[PDB]
Assembly symmetry: C3
Homo-oligomer: 357 residues x 3
Amino acid sequence: DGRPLAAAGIVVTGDKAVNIYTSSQTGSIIIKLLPNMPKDKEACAKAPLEAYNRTLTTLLTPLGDSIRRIQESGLSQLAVAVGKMQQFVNDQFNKTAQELDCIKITQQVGVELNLYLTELTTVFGPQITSPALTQLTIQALYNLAGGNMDYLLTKLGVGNNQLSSLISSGLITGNPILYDSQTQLLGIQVTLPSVGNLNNMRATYLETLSVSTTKGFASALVPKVVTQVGSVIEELDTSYCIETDLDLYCTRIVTFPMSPGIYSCLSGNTSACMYSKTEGALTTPYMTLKGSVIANCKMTTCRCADPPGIISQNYGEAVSLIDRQSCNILSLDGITLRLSGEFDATYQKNISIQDSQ
Amino acid sequence: DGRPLAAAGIVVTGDKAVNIYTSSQTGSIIIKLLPNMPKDKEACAKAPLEAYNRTLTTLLTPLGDSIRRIQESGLSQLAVAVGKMQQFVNDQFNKTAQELDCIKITQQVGVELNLYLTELTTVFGPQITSPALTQLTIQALYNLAGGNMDYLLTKLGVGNNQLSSLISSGLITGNPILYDSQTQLLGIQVTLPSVGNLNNMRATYLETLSVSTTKGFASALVPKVVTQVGSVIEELDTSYCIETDLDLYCTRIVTFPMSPGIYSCLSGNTSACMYSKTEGALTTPYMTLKGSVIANCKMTTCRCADPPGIISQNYGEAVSLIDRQSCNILSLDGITLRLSGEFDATYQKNISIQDSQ
Amino acid sequence: DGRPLAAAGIVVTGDKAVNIYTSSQTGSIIIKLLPNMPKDKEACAKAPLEAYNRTLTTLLTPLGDSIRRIQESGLSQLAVAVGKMQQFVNDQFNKTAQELDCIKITQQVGVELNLYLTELTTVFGPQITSPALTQLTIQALYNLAGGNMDYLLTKLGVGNNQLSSLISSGLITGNPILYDSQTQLLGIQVTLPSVGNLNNMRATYLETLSVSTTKGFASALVPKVVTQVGSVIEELDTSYCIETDLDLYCTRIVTFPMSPGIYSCLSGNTSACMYSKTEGALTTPYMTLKGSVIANCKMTTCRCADPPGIISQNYGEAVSLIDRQSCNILSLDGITLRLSGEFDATYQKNISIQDSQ
Ligand SMILES: *[C@@H]1O[C@H](CO)[C@@H](O[C@@H]2O[C@H](CO)[C@@H](O[C@@H]3O[C@H](CO)[C@@H](O)[C@H](O)[C@@H]3O)[C@H](O)[C@H]2NC(C)=O)[C@H](O)[C@H]1NC(C)=O
Ligand SMILES: *[C@@H]1O[C@H](CO)[C@@H](O[C@@H]2O[C@H](CO)[C@@H](O)[C@H](O)[C@H]2NC(C)=O)[C@H](O)[C@H]1NC(C)=O
Ligand SMILES: *[C@@H]1O[C@H](CO)[C@@H](O[C@@H]2O[C@H](CO)[C@@H](O)[C@H](O)[C@H]2NC(C)=O)[C@H](O)[C@H]1NC(C)=O
Ligand SMILES: *[C@@H]1O[C@H](CO)[C@@H](O[C@@H]2O[C@H](CO)[C@@H](O)[C@H](O)[C@H]2NC(C)=O)[C@H](O)[C@H]1NC(C)=O
Ligand SMILES: *[C@@H]1O[C@H](CO)[C@@H](O[C@@H]2O[C@H](CO)[C@@H](O)[C@H](O)[C@H]2NC(C)=O)[C@H](O)[C@H]1NC(C)=O
Ligand SMILES: *[C@@H]1O[C@H](CO)[C@@H](O)[C@H](O)[C@H]1NC(C)=O
């Protein structure tokens, strides 16, 4: 649509793609809670494994239960000394020899065992923590697509330029359907969608400030969201769509035709537009948008606190932009928005080993 | 309601129960961050404990802070050698004897400790992580109910058939209200609802495809949601209800009467139904629904690329109901949708010990 | 607004402040996954470090991947025995000596290393888990504001009495934008608002019960949400606002004027109020509210099961409140709610060390 209509008081808040989808595809992820241990060097490993396999059931038990409830619905003489004493220390040192191995080995098994639990909870946290559907971690999906993400999406329908969008959409969800307390096995059931992107159709979001022109009583009449494919341009009933920043995942596409004037305006012309005054006294002659503020500097007073100055707008402008680069600290008769700022920080740890005696 | 009206163009997207609820019940979970240690074996335990108790405060300090901020508002001669040498290795080995014990005991205490923290954060993750109200993990609800779930639900009003529903609802939440940094004590305050299920009442969500019948311009006129108790059938104002898959958790029940024609239609008859044509050119003739895709295959070609052949229909039917069995790949003109798919995967870890000497 | 209109059937569900906001401020967190280790005492720490630095990549690799995808778019003789024997046990014990140290040190480096991963995932869980925008944990904000929470809120705009609110708002979000697998460095980009609290303006939520007065058909006509600055009282279009419990974070303040009758009513007068009867047969004559229930105890028989009694209002009252203090178990012809009740429990762990020999 462009923004010549900006001068008409019509501000474009957003433009987005449109797609039809279905939660038809499906999949299952079967988690193996007890890691695959090496053959027999367990006598040592038995210690930590127990602690682990314990919290494990201390954790999952409830999740399991719920799953159920839901589903239901003398040189010669003394020389003897050297004989014994010598053989003895050998035996002792040997005990100590391997006695240092078990420790050395359990030491490692525990740590590895511990890493796995936090890894596990990090990845399937949602599922581990609730019986209902839940968003899937980026890790989970990936594993599910056996590291071959290119493959999965292609099956799903979207391209890379729709991954985050898809993710945030909250369409790819999963849930715990099985928990073998004895084998320590967890069965999650993912649910993917089959997005089918329409084409060359884009929904466009519209917002309107109280412009004067006709009079400071003016406020153009247009819909909130309109879609269009070619010359057609009808009002889109978004009620049937999940709406991400970039895409619009709709189950259906119900729409409505609009006055000929409306079309005429929204499409290049400005005059066609029909203002009016439903607005109340208290309505604010400015609005926020993408970390910026679009305001009818004529209707009020655009005072810029940082670069001192009044941000005025001559005729033809209809509405000013005011953003990070134009001004740095706006003030619109009552409030004071700060249009710029930063913060940096680092998160890190310093380990401190305590020597011993 | 049934589906004779499917012939009329009235597709029924869903049926759900209805219950009034009140966030009146309440509870408090008081966590003890430092595990109950055994009395005396400490000297060894102090090392790991310190580290843990350290990160504990590193994690909870901020959370603690916010809570405040929020609330404000020679046979004889050489024989001697054997005497000393002997007694000596005895003492030394004995040192090494118990010196191998501490290492063994802390080795254990560390792992147990470490596990408890990831357990702790998995269970009370939301709470530990934000001062506001947050969904309760299944594990926490359970603990709170002292393992006796049957008891709790009984008090909340619901039965097992509503457990998943409730959890999904988001009505059961908790928030931190206490954090003794010295004692290492965390105080969560749970808030449970008091759902009182209405009886024999059921809301039914309706949707409508552009049927022809009257002319390919047709499209029945009916509410989007209607509740009913026996012969009574009015429009439901869902604005006052958390909407779960199987249940509707409302705070009130606001409804409106409908045209006698409407009641006639929705209730068996089909003739009473009054169509119209408010739809626009771009409105798609096929909606989507739980994996399948209902569509007016009369209104557009429904080619199925998998088992080939046009899914057709004719007279009396109204709309096709392309299912997964029926077809594996729809093609409603311009947009091909997968209606079936699958994926499986396994999550498991292979520990890999290292040896010593 | 008060409650003299409570006699008119107008119940006030809530009162909230109003503020303008703009996601203009921005910040960046840069995590260091591998802790700062001590100089050359690694030989020992190398073992656990390996495991840790492994699971790290195991975890972050997908996240790192998605980020890319998105961004692309004989006294003399035997005396000799004592000579060697003695010297030997010395050397041997000494090995055992320091062989007991590495085990002591890695014992620690492990636990520390293990905690930092769960801490890390606890803190930047959302960010680690998804490439899209996600709520920031309290611990992250804190860190970002260098422990100096007061300064931050000052820059953002709200006061301490708006922290809880702000967090809940969900306006403060962050998202990964960089994962240096080699250095093991994560790069989160936070986004904070710049709420500019409007002043003395307040949005008042209104709801109405079917009062009789006129007749058990009455049902006053008033908006759902009205704002008011001084004597002005127009209807608010909350459409443009995030709605917290305490605050209303809007992007704009659209409003509409209301009949002079309306104004007259809402502002003290009761008569001016224009009732009607759009209500259906099935509409309930009582609502729920913050753990209590406002009801027309004249329309239905209000009976308190617990403290027995027939809660009943009287001419001019028009409605009743029924608190926890008032009653414990309310009964509204059909349903019974638990206006009160509690639960308490504790969560804690008991470590059980295993002895050795
Ligand atoms: C490694 O070096 C960093 C330097 O950035 C150290 O960071 C500092 O450590 C303190 C203590 O953990 C951090 O937390 C503090 O917590 C108290 C709560 O009692 C709070 O009042 C302080 O405001 C602060 O948040 C602190 O953020 C941080 N300070 C600075 C100037 O960096 C880190 O501790 C070192 N690693 C280790 C293990 O010591
Ligand atoms: C981990 O702990 C679970 C907890 O039960 C163990 O599972 C039980 O195993 C015993 C013996 O194999 C069975 O009699 C039980 O029926 C199992 N389940 C329950 C609930 O008791 C599991 O064997 C443990 N795994 C390891 C390696 O120790
Ligand atoms: C060294 O040898 C033994 C073994 O430790 C000592 O006798 C006690 O034995 C019991 C049972 O194992 C242990 O609980 C005690 O700790 C041992 N005491 C000591 C001091 O270790 C014996 O007393 C020791 N003798 C020498 C010379 O060190
Ligand atoms: C865990 O760490 C906390 C924080 O350092 C310790 O708390 C201190 O405890 C001492 C003794 O009770 C008090 O005098 C201080 O006032 C406490 N400081 C804070 C900030 O609470 C706590 O004692 C440690 N616990 C253990 C078992 O090590
Ligand atoms: C942690 O693991 C990563 C990946 O396994 C290691 O990264 C490699 O680092 C070497 C140099 O040390 C580079 O030559 C490789 O190209 C890196 N590979 C990848 C995939 O990044 C990293 O070295 C490990 N860090 C430590 C301290 O062991
Ligand atoms: C600690 O005691 C409680 C008793 O209420 C018990 O339930 C719990 O299992 C014990 N802790 C451990 C780790 O067993």
